[PDB]
Design an enzyme around this catalytic site. Structure first.
Site, PDB file in Angstrom:
ATOM      1  N   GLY B 173       0.831  -1.303   0.020  1.00  0.00           N
ATOM      2  CA  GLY B 173       0.446  -0.153  -0.495  1.00  0.00           C
ATOM      3  C   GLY B 173       1.108   1.251   0.023  1.00  0.00           C
ATOM      4  N   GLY B 175       4.310   1.384   0.554  1.00  0.00           N
ATOM      5  CA  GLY B 175       5.828   0.732  -0.285  1.00  0.00           C
ATOM      6  C   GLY B 175       5.151   0.893  -1.820  1.00  0.00           C
ATOM      7  N   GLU B 193       9.537  -6.957  -5.980  1.00  0.00           N
ATOM      8  CA  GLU B 193       8.400  -7.047  -4.928  1.00  0.00           C
ATOM      9  C   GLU B 193       7.488  -8.923  -4.718  1.00  0.00           C
ATOM     10  OE1 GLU B 193       6.316  -6.219  -2.578  1.00  0.00           O
ATOM     11  OE2 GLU B 193       4.694  -8.435  -3.719  1.00  0.00           O
ATOM     12  N   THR B 261       9.956  -3.215   2.668  1.00  0.00           N
ATOM     13  CA  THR B 261       9.077  -4.121   2.609  1.00  0.00           C
ATOM     14  C   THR B 261       8.556  -4.272   4.728  1.00  0.00           C
ATOM     15  OG1 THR B 261      10.901  -5.297   3.466  1.00  0.00           O
ATOM     16  CG2 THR B 261      10.633  -5.779   0.933  1.00  0.00           C
ATOM     17  N   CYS B 407      -0.999  17.216   0.731  1.00  0.00           N
ATOM     18  CA  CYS B 407      -0.284  18.366   0.304  1.00  0.00           C
ATOM     19  C   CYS B 407       0.498  19.027   1.922  1.00  0.00           C
ATOM     20  CB  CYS B 407      -1.660  19.038  -0.383  1.00  0.00           C
ATOM     21  SG  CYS B 407      -1.063  21.129  -1.093  1.00  0.00           S
TER      22      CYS B 407
HETATM   23  N1  LIG Z   1       7.776   5.699   8.402  1.00  0.00           N
HETATM   24  C1  LIG Z   1       6.569   5.889   8.773  1.00  0.00           C
HETATM   25  O1  LIG Z   1       6.178   6.587   8.608  1.00  0.00           O
HETATM   26  C2  LIG Z   1       5.904   4.769   7.711  1.00  0.00           C
HETATM   27  C3  LIG Z   1       4.385   5.621   6.901  1.00  0.00           C
HETATM   28  C4  LIG Z   1       4.235   4.359   6.430  1.00  0.00           C
HETATM   29  C5  LIG Z   1       4.605   2.651   5.734  1.00  0.00           C
HETATM   30  N2  LIG Z   1       5.581   2.787   6.994  1.00  0.00           N
HETATM   31  C6  LIG Z   1       5.831   1.534   6.116  1.00  0.00           C
HETATM   32  O2  LIG Z   1       6.403   0.515   5.718  1.00  0.00           O
HETATM   33  C7  LIG Z   1       6.444  -0.829   5.345  1.00  0.00           C
HETATM   34  C8  LIG Z   1       5.461  -0.764   4.031  1.00  0.00           C
HETATM   35  O3  LIG Z   1       4.175  -0.565   4.275  1.00  0.00           O
HETATM   36  P1  LIG Z   1       2.870  -1.125   3.445  1.00  0.00           P
HETATM   37  O4  LIG Z   1       1.939  -0.327   3.740  1.00  0.00           O
HETATM   38  O5  LIG Z   1       3.774  -1.632   1.884  1.00  0.00           O
HETATM   39  O6  LIG Z   1       3.297  -2.561   3.928  1.00  0.00           O
HETATM   40  P2  LIG Z   1       1.841  -4.360   3.428  1.00  0.00           P
HETATM   41  O7  LIG Z   1       2.290  -4.933   3.913  1.00  0.00           O
HETATM   42  O8  LIG Z   1       1.033  -2.988   2.413  1.00  0.00           O
HETATM   43  O9  LIG Z   1       3.421  -4.370   1.730  1.00  0.00           O
HETATM   44  C9  LIG Z   1       4.489  -5.187   2.477  1.00  0.00           C
HETATM   45  C10 LIG Z   1       5.091  -5.396   0.538  1.00  0.00           C
HETATM   46  O10 LIG Z   1       6.095  -5.952   0.706  1.00  0.00           O
HETATM   47  C11 LIG Z   1       6.365  -7.268   0.307  1.00  0.00           C
HETATM   48  N3  LIG Z   1       7.505  -8.250   1.113  1.00  0.00           N
HETATM   49  C12 LIG Z   1       8.090  -8.505   1.946  1.00  0.00           C
HETATM   50  N4  LIG Z   1       8.811  -9.378   2.485  1.00  0.00           N
HETATM   51  C13 LIG Z   1       9.415  -9.069   0.472  1.00  0.00           C
HETATM   52  C14 LIG Z   1      10.563  -9.662   0.402  1.00  0.00           C
HETATM   53  N5  LIG Z   1      11.623 -10.144   1.095  1.00  0.00           N
HETATM   54  N6  LIG Z   1      10.575  -9.107  -0.916  1.00  0.00           N
HETATM   55  C15 LIG Z   1      10.234  -8.555  -1.919  1.00  0.00           C
HETATM   56  N7  LIG Z   1       8.933  -8.056  -1.339  1.00  0.00           N
HETATM   57  C16 LIG Z   1       8.526  -8.063  -0.371  1.00  0.00           C
HETATM   58  C17 LIG Z   1       5.031  -7.643   1.218  1.00  0.00           C
HETATM   59  O11 LIG Z   1       4.711  -8.918  -0.591  1.00  0.00           O
HETATM   60  C18 LIG Z   1       4.148  -6.358  -0.161  1.00  0.00           C
HETATM   61  O12 LIG Z   1       3.238  -6.555  -0.966  1.00  0.00           O
HETATM   62  C19 LIG Z   1       5.798  -0.960   6.298  1.00  0.00           C
HETATM   63  O13 LIG Z   1       7.021  -1.720   7.785  1.00  0.00           O
HETATM   64  C20 LIG Z   1       5.461   0.180   7.217  1.00  0.00           C
HETATM   65  O14 LIG Z   1       4.743   0.314   8.315  1.00  0.00           O
HETATM   66  C21 LIG Z   1       6.375   3.650   7.526  1.00  0.00           C
END
Ligand SMILES: NC(=O)c1ccc[n+]([C@@H]2O[C@H](COP(=O)([O-])OP(=O)(O)OC[C@H]3O[C@@H](n4cnc5c(N)ncnc54)[C@H](O)[C@@H]3O)[C@@H](O)[C@H]2O)c1
Ligand SMILES: NC(=O)c1ccc[n+]([C@@H]2O[C@H](COP(=O)([O-])OP(=O)(O)OC[C@H]3O[C@@H](n4cnc5c(N)ncnc54)[C@H](O)[C@@H]3O)[C@@H](O)[C@H]2O)c1
Ligand SMILES: O=C(O)/C=C/c1c[nH]cn1
Ligand SMILES: O=C(O)/C=C/c1c[nH]cn1
Lengths: 550, 550
Positions: B173, B175, B193, B261, B407
């Protein structure tokens, strides 16, 4: 830095310092928290429980008093770990002060990190009511300790504790309430305290009756007094980690055992066996990690003594200082074989929203409180336990700083009392406005697995969403100042809780806020225990008409 | 009870289901959070970031929708870890919903305990905007990811990134916004991915351009487009733990390396090297402890590859998924040799209160957002970067669920925008009311040592008083719904953060609440950074006339 040789006491009478009573109240309660007759070590801003402080340091104290004095009726002060960080526009029905003390991201929620931040001037331990300005000396916890002993007596000694004695330790701000509570519950007690100044403090405030000259002498008095069916509290100057194991060796058999030393904080609140409080304080700055270890090793021996007493069949319980946890981390695997005071004795009260409800007369007049006492008896005409408690408080609890009263009541009655008190301020019966509050130890304001939420029937012990919601709801409802603290009672990492205080200034606006916050505050507690599945709480919720969706 | 074969989408138009717009808004956004076009796995209530959910389970989902539907103007619904646990009387200027999700007492703040609670039906991970109902699909984070890349480009490559490429992974979502962000920043990108369905989601939503057929084909495309000064994103089905180490070995040199991820939750969001997603989710409930072990061992190798790129001079940074921490715990001692994205690239923006500010049109009509886009340019006529962002969004950002807009603006402008939009709702320029919110990643609403508050200049990383104060103040000011979550972004034990959303219903009452909360919210952010000593924040405070006592 943290030391200033001054005596602070809350301003008395009706002449305001701040701009309104809603801002004069927190200003007077902050100061009352440091009154020489109330706080343990106010020259160093220490109110109670280890290093529980009212302000981060003196410069921040000065700034809080200065800001509070200029604060407007539509402004809200943000206090961050004892520091006034910002003032923002809200409205007259929002809290005038919003407080967040000692909160740390979980992975870093420990004394070590806290101490590191403190050294950088970035921290303050708010304990529970220390950083939230609603502390009233030993009276704050005395009814709870009394209720704990009464219930333990009912469970193990069929009612009265006459001829029985309690063995415990810790005559600090809150621990000092133990002797009077034991006495009011009909028991004698041996209260071991390592600092002579604290024993003197309890004597001056008439919370403990006398001091033995040594262990043998202490036992001779307990023997005499118990044989006489008298209820006398005895202080014994010494170390719990030395005496409890010795009494076990001697085969001495107390009637109930507990402890209230500040074990929640190894560095500052628990003396290692053989050390003097003075060696303890100096080394704490030199070899902190070494001091901590020595403190915990003694806790291990101390708890092992408590376990041995329990093995003998003596009712034993942890009274919220996290000493079992310390002992356990130091090797005592069965440390949790004896329970915490809440799952063991007090939870039923929390299910009805009953907790350390309290109020203080801002006027400083003893008669203001007596009048409220009378009004409560009038509002709760058929509760002999409560009338007897008010009598005992009147006859045996001496005021500390601003006269104040501890009176355990729950969902329903809290608001009844609050509106009534507001009516008394308006009519002039009470000479000045009164503030209603409570400890953070309360039905829906605390999440603490080794104390208040230990062994919840559904296993929800660690869920802390509740205290956060209570603070948020109190803010929405209109309490005068709301707070969110971390680690009060059991120390860094083991608890999250909220506080609330609301001013009864006799106005219609106040009555409006009072009616909802005093229904909601205990309501979240009943709600929280009903969610856990407690029949008492679900019944209370229904009788009071709470809207619990699920 | 956790799976329901239905498609949920926010009600549309001006017809109300709830009793008023203040209660209709959270109801529509809750549903919007589960739109087939917005959420990652809505049938399982999963919105994004591993197992970030909108409600605890379907039973609790119906109950909240139901309660929200009858909630009065002076009532406040309490939501506890995605469960509607109680409704209490407040006032029309307080929030309609108070939300507290995933909060656990520090000593128990870990996935292991969370999972135990989840199994007993006692938990729900709210991530940041999943459980707080203000998620707007990939657009929510895209500008932030865009700003990070733009800044990294200004710092390392002279500014524009033409002919450069980013290497990262995770097309979930949030990423999924990486590829498009890279493109909008002018760089090509290889986004690996492991789930084909996710690659298809980004492709359908226009967030990624094409899919290589393998590493070599991908490298051939990067080489080609990069030399030609094109800015196209490439998806590559695979496992980063295998691909990154391979590229390091081939001597491949990206111009920027990061990762997104779901490493924050070993059990649910990170596929171990050599595992099929099928085996992953099956073993998750068979040998969870083993799966966590496997996932983390892969993270170690993944982080090491990232460390290797940095040794080659490739700008490398952690993008908030706690992967370094996991690697460090797995023996990668120097895992923190490359920085988090905020202290390296975004912090200066936070110092001015700039952050993922956004709004959604409850009407569901795109032209409503277009009108706000035009309004924004009118109110901020001298910010070409801002305008260029709006143009690129209109151009390349496809709406998801209810038309929404991200924004980045800070202290001062937020309230200018909020009051204007409210006035557009009043005049009818806007079909229906719009909600103004943000992610919990913002200047004064999050403490996260491995992310947003990583390397604060005074060492105050772990101080979490700030977000608790932000939530308290938002409640006091009048936001429509306020939330306090634990473990968003980085997972259990590593963060605490608040959220807020305020409805603009064209009303004067809404107007006065907008002025306050839209000033205060970003205000606490400038305050927090000013307190840490950042001159940029101090200046902003002075320009905006913030009242910061100290
Ligand atoms: N720092 C912040 O404020 C902030 C903001 C938004 C999201 N995030 C973090 O970013 C990360 C991703 O968010 P999201 O919404 O995409 O989560 P998500 O669960 O919707 O998507 C994660 C993706 O990673 C893929 N994946 C997992 N392991 C993998 C690997 N070894 N190789 C390739 N792909 C792999 C999964 O297939 C999935 O498509 C999470 O840890 C989320 O908490 C941090
Ligand atoms: N469970 C709850 O909600 C709750 C409520 C109130 C207080 N508490 C806890 O109760 C404990 C005591 O509170 P306080 O206000 O009295 O703390 P305090 O610091 O004011 O006093 C503690 C006393 O313990 C004495 N002491 C320390 N080690 C000793 C030893 N080995 N032998 C004899 N005496 C020793 C010290 O001399 C000191 O006088 C603290 O841990 C506090 O957090 C818990
Ligand atoms: O009784 C009080 O004022 C507060 C006592 C307390 C509870 N937890 C830590 N201190
Ligand atoms: O942009 C959002 O909707 C929330 C993104 C986020 C922040 N932290 C974890 N997820």
């Amino acid at each position: 830095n943290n030391y200033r040789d001054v005596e602070i006491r809350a301003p008395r009478g009706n002449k305001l310092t701040a701009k309104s009573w809603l801002t004069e109240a927190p200003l007077r309660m902050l100061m009352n928290n440091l009154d020489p007759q109330v706080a343990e070590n106010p020259k160093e801003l220490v109110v109670y429980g280890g290093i529980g402080r009212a302000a981060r340091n003196w410069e921040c104290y000065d700034k809080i008093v200065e800001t509070l004095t200029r604060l407007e009726d539509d402004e809200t002060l943000l206090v961050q770990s004892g520091k006034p960080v910002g003032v923002f526009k809200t409205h007259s029905n929002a809290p005038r002060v919003l407080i967040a003390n000692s909160n740390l991201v979980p992975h870093w929620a420990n004394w070590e990190h806290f101490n590191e931040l403190d050294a950088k001037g970035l921290a303050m331990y708010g304990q529970m009511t220390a950083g939230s300005w609603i502390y009233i000396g030993s009276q704050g916890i005395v009814q709870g300790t009394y209720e704990t002993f009464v219930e333990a007596g009912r469970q193990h000694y069929g009612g009265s504790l006459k001829g029985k004695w309690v063995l415990t330790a810790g005559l600090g701000g809150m621990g000092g309430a133990q002797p009077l509570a034991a006495t009011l519950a009909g028991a004698c007690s041996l209260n071991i305290e390592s600092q002579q100044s604290r024993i003197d403090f309890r004597l001056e405030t008439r919370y403990v009756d006398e001091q033995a000259t040594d262990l043998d002498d202490a036992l001779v008095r307990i023997a005499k007094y118990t044989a006489e069916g008298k209820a006398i509290s005895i202080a014994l100057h010494g170390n719990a980690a030395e005496i409890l194991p010795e009494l076990v060796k001697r085969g001495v058999r107390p009637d109930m055992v507990t402890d209230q030393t500040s074990a929640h904080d190894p560095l500052n609140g628990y003396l290692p066996a053989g050390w003097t409080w003075e060696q303890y304080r100096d080394r704490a700055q030199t070899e902190p990690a070494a001091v901590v270890k020595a403190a915990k090793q003694s806790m291990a021996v101390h708890v092992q003594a408590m376990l041995d007493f329990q093995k003998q069949g003596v009712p034993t319980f942890d009274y919220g200082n996290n000493i079992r946890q310390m002992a356990k981390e130091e090797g005592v695997a069965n440390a949790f074989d004896f329970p915490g005071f809440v799952p063991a004795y007090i939870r039923p009260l929390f299910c009805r929203g009953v907790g350390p409800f309290r109020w203080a007369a801002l006027s400083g007049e003893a008669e203001d409180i007596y009048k409220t006492d009378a009004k409560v008896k009038e509002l709760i005409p058929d509760d002999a336990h409560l009338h007897r408690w008010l009598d005992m408080a009147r006859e045996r609890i001496s005021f500390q700083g601003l006269p104040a009263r501890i009176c355990w009541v729950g969902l329903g009655l809290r608001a009844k009392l609050g509106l009534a008190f507001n009516e008394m301020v308006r009519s002039g019966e009470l000479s000045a406005p009164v503030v209603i509050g409570r400890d953070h130890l309360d039905s829906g304001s605390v999440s603490s697995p080794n104390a208040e939420t230990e062994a919840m029937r559904d296993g929800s012990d660690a869920v802390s969403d509740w205290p956060l919601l209570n603070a948020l709801l109190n803010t929405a409802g209109g309490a005068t100042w709301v707070s969110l603290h971390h680690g009060g009672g059991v120390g860094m990492g083991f608890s999250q809780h909220s506080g609330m205080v609301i001013v009864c200034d006799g106005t219609d606006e106040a009555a409006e806020r009072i009616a909802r916050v005093l229904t909601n505050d205990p309501g979240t507690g009943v709600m929280r225990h009903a969610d856990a599945g407690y029949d008492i709480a679900i019944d209370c919720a229904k009788e009071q008409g709470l809207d619990l969706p699920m």
